[PDB]
Design a protein around this ligand. Structure first.
Ligand SMILES: Nc1nc2c(ncn2[C@H]2C[C@H](O)[C@@H](COP(=O)(O)OP(=O)(O)OP(=O)(O)O)O2)c(=O)[nH]1
Ligand SMILES: [Mn+2]
Ligand SMILES: [Mn+2]
Length: 175
DNA sequence: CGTTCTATGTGTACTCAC
DNA sequence: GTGAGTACA
DNA sequence: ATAGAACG
């Protein structure tokens, strides 16, 4: 069920105004500023296996509800797997079935989440390997030295990459 | 000593014993 | 409930 | 990125 970069962007553009979740009866819309395209789509690969969306949820209490009660106005989908942090959907788009992957992160995690979910995997592996040799650990939630969050005065992914000590490259060029 | 090749990470969701 | 183990972000 | 191993 493969698709083009253009089809990818069409769908993401369509979902951007339509994602919401049920929170104890009421239907809360997810805001565009908290929807970030990730994976191969953000890396502008000509062909994609799926669409990967990162949702930034504004508080920890809400994690229990967003993905497990995710809603998409006017589009039929089925749920393959679903937990608080990762959700996989099969959506119907123009009489065709496409795979939509949803992930979640808290605001304090945004740049780590983006850095992780942008990929590619081989780039994650090598960046992390390097940090391990200097006794740091990195993941989707933060940077670490001996079980402790390194507080970093940074907001964007670019700021994080440069803080970590690596060449910043646009997603297309990461490898 | 230099060139080149190779290997490498960290966490989530689900299922199935006991 | 906990923990082993697979599949896979 | 980086470091070890095989090769020159
Ligand atoms: N596949 C995979 N992805 C990971 C892993 N760790 C972090 N990720 C992140 C980086 C990936 O780009 C992102 C989405 O995974 P996908 O498997 O959808 O791959 P991606 O979109 O790069 O390419 P594709 O979907 O294959 O066109 O999740 C991992 O171990 N495996
Ligand atoms: Mn993908
Ligand atoms: Mn994916």
């Amino acid at each position: 069920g493969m698709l083009t970069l253009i089809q990818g962007k069409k769908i993401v553009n369509h979902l951007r105004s339509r994602l919401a979740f049920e929170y104890n009866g009421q239907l809360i819309k997810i805001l565009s500023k908290n929807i970030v395209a990730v994976g191969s789509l953000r890396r502008e690969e000509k062909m994609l296996n799926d669409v990967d969306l990162l949702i930034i949820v504004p508080e920890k209490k809400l994690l229990k509800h967003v993905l497990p009660n995710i809603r998409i106005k006017g589009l039929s989908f089925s749920v393959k797997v679903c937990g608080e942090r990762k959700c996989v959907l099969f959506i119907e788009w123009e009489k065709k079935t496409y795979q939509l992957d949803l992930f979640t992160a808290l605001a304090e995690e945004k740049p780590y989440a983006i850095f992780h979910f942008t990929g590619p995997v081989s780039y994650l592996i090598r960046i992390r390997a390097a940090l391990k040799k200097k006794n740091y650990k990195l993941n989707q939630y933060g940077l670490f030295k001996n079980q402790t969050l390194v507080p970093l005065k940074i907001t964007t992914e670019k700021e994080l990459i440069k803080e970590l000590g690596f060449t910043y490259r646009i997603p297309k060029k990461r490898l």
